[PDB]
Design a protein around this ligand. Structure first.
Ligand SMILES: CC(C)n1ncnc1-c1cn2c(n1)-c1ccc(O[C@@H](C)C(N)=O)cc1OCC2
Length: 879
């Protein structure tokens, strides 16, 4: 209890709300979640204690490693006959030892050769990256570590520090995981034996304050299971309906994930005033019964089935009182034994159907009447993108051939949307198909966790595909989306949240961003309880890292508080006076300690040492962000970077930039693996709160305006920065990077480019900043190549009619079609992000912008001609 109280304060500080507020929640789902989730906490801690010293180090310092050991061919060509030159430092004074060695060498082999060269100068060691807290604790090939592959790709010398194993292990403390205090804690009839249609009683509304009627519907995801039913019209002075609304569904046919969606509307031009959604079955599989009160949400269509389920935690809001049916017994959803037997009964009955019986329905087909054309038709349908319309004929067709669909596993999402979810006979059969369904790729499985797929059997299958096949690399890459799709889950306790929590608690690189993605949305009352309770479970079992997270939370909090004062109190004051106030307030003993000596939330391998106050400044950009500079206190910081530079911005939504930078990284990965070296720059960006976040500074980079402050000025600047033999590499890097950003920005519909949001590095690497908006915010061309860009592309020249420009065009075409081939991934990544509150990504029609820019209905050659035409019209010729 004494140690628990201190831990409760630590967790309360981390999550931004006290633990006691969870204790006072009456809802038994909340209290069951808190108790039952501790299984995952226990399991994770055991894996860390299994092989205790090394396995604890593996948790804290996991290998930053690529998914595949196999190297792309053009990256292998950068090596000297498949060998890499590596520098290994030994602190005795620092002593370097340059080794020329095979790229696929194991760290232990690399350590041995360093000792041999040290012996020429006359398993107890581990390799560390010089300048940051990144270690090579696992037996991978050296080239698979992301630091080395980055070094090979960029043509940089890898600098590693030889360190004693016991020096690392002694730093890692043993955290004893303790279970909390809350650990120690008519008839029943089946759904299918209730011969009755669905009825729901709407009683009355309270807190209906204005200067009406209740619309309702029953939904499986975004799909209606029957017609919407309205109450009779009533004046807002007395909202008391007391009507039994009758729905066209048999109760036995209600799917597991069935939801009552409702709204109070005003009356023609109808308009929603407030909305609310309810699960028709609770977390214990029990059908909702008796009286209930639902506090509604403000409108951001008359109903909102995409919106989150459950009551508004704000109780000073419109509150509809509801009553459900009574059957003199506790109604529960049937077990899988009952479902399997019913499916088996249906399959055998259908297999007995005659020619004429099967002829009654297009959803029924005979077993020995599957021709070669219809098999290839199913294959053709499966290749189509997620936003492509599946007609009712195709749905009937897909379902009738569902047993053949098992042989083409990737078609599952199409088949699932073809199912009649208001028919227990079909759903029961679909459950048995999903149960034994073969594994699909993690990227394909991710689609089945978005808002179109609410069924727990379907989502369980998706989670199992991730458990079996999703690497830690790709989990880290897609964590943003996987956190978002938790919002679509019916219940607090589910297979997805258990999978993500276990990975967060067995991989501290994952756990770090897991914490911050959840923490960043704790202001949002749509997800505050779920994320708060999930964060509690994480903090209770993450070990020593809670204390390091609390350093980061306090550092951010003091930066939030400081920037709030400057944009409220000292709004209209000069830069000199604001800076004097800033430096004085930061130099306060409590502030100064809080704002230095912690890990970067952008990358927890980076230690932020002492602040360089003289290097810090208030920027002239929108919302006046802070430019912050810390010393890197790493002993070999000079070999990576001496100073860590971060932009702290308080005022603007940084989630759009975060998503774009992630997508840019994924686009770059596709191009690099395909074998076209178009270097992008997806710099770090992290939303930490409500319109608050961090941005990674790229060193030695300048905006186009800063270069200029003639058309040849930009090309002349790169000449001066890259004189002699380096010049050709700089122009090449510029052309290749410019080509990637041209293609990326057009596809995504990024905000209009200009001289202040395009940047160029000294070496020639072009990139974009401040994305802000994407998609349909007819298809625009954000990055118009002015003559400045074309002149440098053409090496100073009629820059349109040159071989350098024709080369540049071919890079753009190859890059365009490469992304077209991976269109489903990007559509799915955007679809998983619809639950987020980004205003430009609210519906599937917003995502349909990518369908247009990638020209998916059109052919591959027609897609190039479309892309060429957009570039031609934007630039007024050339393409
Ligand atoms: C406008 C800004 C606050 N912003 N808004 C949304 N994204 C950015 C944003 C993103 N980056 C930057 N800014 C950035 C700026 C300045 C900079 O160097 C200084 C010396 C300069 N050129 O004056 C280096 C930089 O690194 C690239 C990443």
């Amino acid at each position: 209890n004494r140690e628990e109280k201190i831990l409760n304060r630590e967790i309360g500080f981390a999550i931004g709300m006290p633990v006691c507020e969870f204790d006072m929640v009456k809802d038994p789902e909340v209290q069951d979640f808190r108790r039952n989730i501790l299984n995952v906490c226990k399991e994770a801690v055991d894996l860390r204690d299994l092989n205790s010293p090394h396995s604890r180090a593996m948790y804290v310092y996991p290998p930053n490693v690529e998914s595949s050991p196999e190297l792309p061919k053009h990256i292998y060509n950068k090596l000297d006959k498949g060998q890499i030159i590596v520098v290994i430092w030994v602190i005795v004074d620092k002593q370097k030892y340059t080794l020329k060695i095979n790229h696929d060498c194991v760290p232990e082999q690399v350590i041995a050769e360093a000792i041999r060269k040290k012996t020429r100068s006359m398993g107890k060691y581990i390799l560390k990256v010089c300048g940051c807290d990144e270690y090579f604790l696992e037996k991978y090939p050296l080239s698979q570590y992301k630091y080395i592959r980055s070094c090979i790709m960029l043509g940089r010398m890898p600098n590693l520090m030889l360190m004693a194993k016991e020096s690392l292990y002694s730093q890692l403390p043993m955290d004893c995981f303790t279970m909390p205090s809350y650990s120690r804690r008519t008839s029943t009839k089946s759904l299918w034996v209730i011969n009755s249609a669905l009825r729901i009683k709407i009683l009355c509304a309270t807190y209906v304050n204005v200067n009406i009627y209740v619309r309702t519907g029953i939904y499986h995801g975004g799909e209606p299971l029957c017609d919407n039913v309205n109450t009779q019209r009533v004046p807002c002075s007395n909202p008391r309906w007391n009507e039994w609304l009758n729905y066209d569904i048999y109760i036995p046919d209600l799917p597991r994930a069935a939801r009552l969606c409702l709204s109070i509307c005003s009356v023609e031009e109808h308009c929603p005033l407030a909305w609310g959604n309810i699960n028709l079955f609770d977390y214990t599989d029990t059908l909702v019964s008796g009286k209930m009160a639902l506090n509604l949400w403000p409108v951001p269509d008359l109903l909102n089935p995409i919106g989150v389920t459950g009551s508004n935690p704000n109780k000073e809001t419109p509150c509809l009182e509801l009553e459900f049916d009574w059957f003199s017994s506790v109604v529960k959803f049937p077990d899988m034994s009952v479902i399997e037997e019913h499916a088996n009964w249906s399959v055998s009955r259908e297999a007995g159907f005659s020619y004429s019986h099967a002829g009654l329905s297009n959803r029924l087909a005979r077993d020995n009447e599957l021709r070669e054309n219809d098999k290839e038709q199913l294959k053709a349908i499966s290749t189509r993108d997620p936003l492509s319309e599946i007609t009712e004929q195709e749905k009937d067709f897909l379902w009738s051939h569902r047993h053949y669909c098992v042989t083409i596993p990737e078609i599952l999402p199409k088949l699932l949307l073809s199912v009649k979810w208001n028919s227990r006979d079909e759903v029961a059969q679909m459950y048995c198909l999903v149960k034994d369904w073969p594994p699909i790729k993690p990227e394909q499985a991710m689609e089945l966790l978005d808002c179109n797929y609410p069924d727990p059997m379907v989502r369980g299958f998706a989670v199992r595909c991730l458990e079996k096949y999703l690497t830690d690399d790709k989990l880290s890459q897609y964590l943003i989306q996987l956190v978002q799709v938790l919002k679509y889950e019916q219940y607090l306790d589910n297979l997805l949240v258990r999978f993500l929590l276990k990975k967060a608690l067995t991989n501290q690189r994952i756990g770090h961003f897991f914490f911050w993605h959840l923490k960043s949305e704790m202001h949002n009352k749509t997800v505050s309880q779920r994320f708060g309770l999930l964060l509690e479970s994480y903090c209770r079992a993450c070990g020593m890292y809670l204390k390091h997270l609390n350093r980061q939370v306090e550092a951010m909090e003091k930066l939030i508080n400081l920037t709030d004062i400057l944009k409220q109190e000292k709004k209209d004051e000069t830069q000199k006076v604001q800076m004097k106030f800033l430096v004085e307030q930061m130099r306060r003993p409590d502030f100064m300690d809080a704002l230095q000596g912690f890990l970067s939330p952008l990358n927890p391998a980076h230690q932020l040492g002492n602040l360089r106050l003289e290097e810090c400044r208030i920027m002239s950009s929108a919302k006046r962000p802070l430019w912050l500079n810390w010393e890197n206190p790493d002993i070999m910081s000079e070999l990576l970077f001496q100073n860590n530079e971060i932009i702290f911005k308080n005022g603007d939504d940084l989630r759009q930039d975060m998503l774009t930078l992630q997508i840019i990284r994924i686009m770059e990965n596709i191009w690099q693996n395909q074998g076209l070296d178009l270097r992008m720059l997806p710099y770090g960006c992290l939303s930490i709160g409500d319109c608050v976040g961090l941005i990674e500074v790229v060193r030695n980079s300048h905006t186009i305006m800063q270069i200029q402050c003639n058309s040849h000025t930009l090309h002349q600047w790169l000449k001066d920065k890259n004189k002699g033999e380096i010049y050709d590499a700089a122009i090449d890097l510029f052309t290749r990077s410019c080509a990637g950003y041209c293609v990326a920005t057009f596809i995504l519909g990024i905000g209009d480019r200009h001289n202040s949001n395009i940047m160029v590095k000294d070496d020639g690497q072009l990139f974009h900043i401040d994305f802000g908006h994407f998609l349909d915010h007819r298809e625009r061309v954000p990055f118009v190549l002015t003559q400045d860009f074309l002149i440098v592309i053409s090496k100073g020249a009629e820059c349109t009619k040159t071989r350098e420009f024709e080369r540049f065009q071919e890079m753009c075409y190859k890059a365009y079609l490469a992304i077209r081939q991976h269109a489903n991934l990007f559509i799915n990544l955007f679809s998983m992000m619809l639950g987020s509150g980004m205003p430009e990504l609210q519906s599937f029609d917003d995502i349909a912008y990518i369908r247009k820019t990638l020209a998916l209905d059109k052919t591959e050659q027609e897609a190039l001609e479309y892309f060429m035409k957009q570039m031609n019209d934007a630039h007024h010729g050339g393409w």
